[PDB]
Amino acid sequence: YISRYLTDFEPIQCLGRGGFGVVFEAKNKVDDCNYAIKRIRLPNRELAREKVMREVKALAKLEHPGIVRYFNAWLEAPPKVYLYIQMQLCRKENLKDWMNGRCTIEERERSVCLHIFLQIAEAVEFLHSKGLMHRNLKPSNIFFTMDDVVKVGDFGLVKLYMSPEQIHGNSYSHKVDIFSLGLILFELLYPFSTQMERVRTLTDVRNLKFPPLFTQKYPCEYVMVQDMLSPSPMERPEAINIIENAVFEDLDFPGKT
Ligand SMILES: CNc1ncc2cc(-c3c(C)ccc(C(=O)Nc4ccc(OC)c(C(F)(F)F)c4)c3N)ccc2n1
């Protein structure tokens, strides 16, 4: 039996795993580039297989600077069944890691944080414009390219960020992603020293109880986070309304571009 993956790529390392999948870094022999390759063992569940196959088709149609670049997808059945998905290789350190390495307010300059957030919101806006919703938006699903371009996706390298309507298992709309955005904006601007402090504070912010020093330092951002975290989905602003906010006009910081 001839395996496409072993024939065409030289494996470099395991990048991680989660759910049905394992992710490898591997170099393509012909083009000499390194890629992130997800190997999905197709589940025994036909409806889960339906979702997997449908989602690769949807991904393949997407082109946006804030969405991880897609290259290829194929099936292999050795003598159970694997779906391989080949993507652009991003940096190892995601948004969660990036925030964890910047635990002082000096390391979270306003314009830098808003610049990162804007990119996330624009990626979310793109998805919504295509009739898609992320549903699982969180810092561990937000990576950076080698050039620090933020990439939103479904990484699966294994909750506080999901909307109330999702937690209760109710029906929902694209507005669920707006809730996640609110918590992320806050988290970007507000550095944590311990994991215990992070959980406590984000849980409070979920219920619209904000640290007093945040509300005073960032009055404009405080307002937009409140609106994004509205318990009622319909009261939450659209992604396009977020990105058009004056707060994002003419962002600049030393070293930008
Ligand atoms: C550590 N470096 C690194 N770099 C790139 C990586 C790419 C992936 C990755 C792989 C290998 C395969 C698929 C994705 C992905 O984002 N999939 C995906 C599937 C469906 C979707 O909706 C149609 C989307 C969305 F972003 F459009 F929502 C995204 C994805 N993020 C995983 C780990 C990675 N790890």
Q: How many residues does this entry show for the chain?
A: 257
Distances in whole angstroms, Cα of residue 88 to Cα of each of 23, 91, 114, 155, 173: 12, 10, 25, 12, 29
DSSP three-state, residue 86: strand
Between CA 38 and CA 16 the distance in angstroms is 9
User: What spacing in Å lies between the alpha carbon of 49 and ligand 1's midpoint?
Assistant: 17
Residues spanned by CATH 1.10.510.10 within the chain? 90-257
Cβ(22) to ligand 1 under 6 A? no
Architecture in CATH of 90-257: Orthogonal Bundle (1.10)
Strand pairing category for 9-18 and 150-152: unpaired
**Residue with token string 């910047």:** 102
Q: Are 133 and 174 in contact (CB under 8 A)?
A: yes
Single-letter code of the amino acid located at 247? V
Between CA 141 and CA 148 the distance in angstroms is 15
Q: Which atom belonging to ligand 1 lies closest to the Cα atom of 156?
A: 32
The helix/strand count (H/E) of the chain reads as 10, 7
Best CATH choice for the domain 1-89 from the list 3.40.50.300, 3.30.300.250, 3.30.200.20, 3.40.190.10: 3.30.200.20
Distances in whole angstroms, Cα of residue 136 to Cα of each of 9, 96, 141: 30, 14, 8
Helix axes 110-129, 175-189, angle to 10 degrees: 170
User: What spacing in Å lies between the alpha carbon of 107 and ligand 1's midpoint?
Assistant: 28
HEC assignment per residue over 19-60 = CCEEEEEEEECCCCCEEEEEEEECCCCHHHHHHHHHHHHHHH
Rg (CA), the chain: 19
